Point group: C2
Chain length 142, copies 2
């Protein structure tokens, strides 16, 4: 078994893509994260849904999780307002969670090794032609 045969079809977005597309993909496809590439179409980072959640909730709400002293009646309306006119790049954190890359021809153990190094959930396969999740790797060996 090699990278290419292991890989599955993961949706991908660009740095300059709509922030909204990314949110919709995460939500529609119920994915825990998105593969982000640059203009070239080469791997850049991974944008986890939890980072998007962080971006979408106002700081003042985040600072009062029990809502004991602040009011927000506009969560959904404001989610909508702050995505409009914004790119994927703005959703990303200060130090974007890097995206490990393996070849189309790497062995299972080569892939597992790299994944096991960063305890990363996902690797991109390049020749991006796909990606290999941890569970996919487990699925193969079992």
């Amino acid at each position: 078994m090699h990278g290419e045969q292991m890989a599955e079809q993961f949706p991908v977005v660009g740095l300059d893509s709509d922030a909204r597309e990314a949110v919709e993909l995460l939500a529609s496809r119920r994915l825990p994260g998105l593969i982000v590439v640059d203009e070239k179409g080469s791997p850049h980072s991974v944008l986890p849904a939890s980072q998007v959640v962080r971006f979408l909730v106002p700081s003042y709400v985040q600072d009062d999780p029990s809502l004991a002293r602040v009011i927000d009646e506009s969560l959904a309306d404001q989610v909508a307002d702050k995505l409009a006119g914004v790119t994927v790049r703005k959703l990303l954190p200060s130090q974007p969670a890097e995206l490990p890359v393996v070849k189309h021809d790497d062995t299972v153990l080569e892939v597992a090794a790299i994944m096991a190094r960063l305890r990363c959930p996902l690797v991109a396969v390049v020749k991006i032609i796909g990606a290999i999740t941890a569970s996919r790797l487990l699925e193969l060996v079992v």
Copy 2:
């Protein structure tokens, strides 16, 4: 809605339950993680598939020697997990698993998951785990059509 309605069913395994069995579940159900509970059923931790991968790949392959060794993971896997429990699969400092009250509002859950930036939270009602709310599930609720 409240945390109760937001939550979805999520598979759970015991801390002292069989490691191999948990991996079979992670693999088949194609899950990012399992919710781990203790003997009496209380939320304890999450077991991500990636951590299982870490557990299976020796450190000398972590720290290309992969390709210089005549050892295949598929073979080894059963050997490494025999007699082993979920507890041993966990990292030395297991991730906390935030647990929201079933009657929390959507705003509260959002505020919590934003603040903590956690991939999921368990939902509990009367000391029982009734499901979980992932980050993407939260997003799906806040951008749902109305």
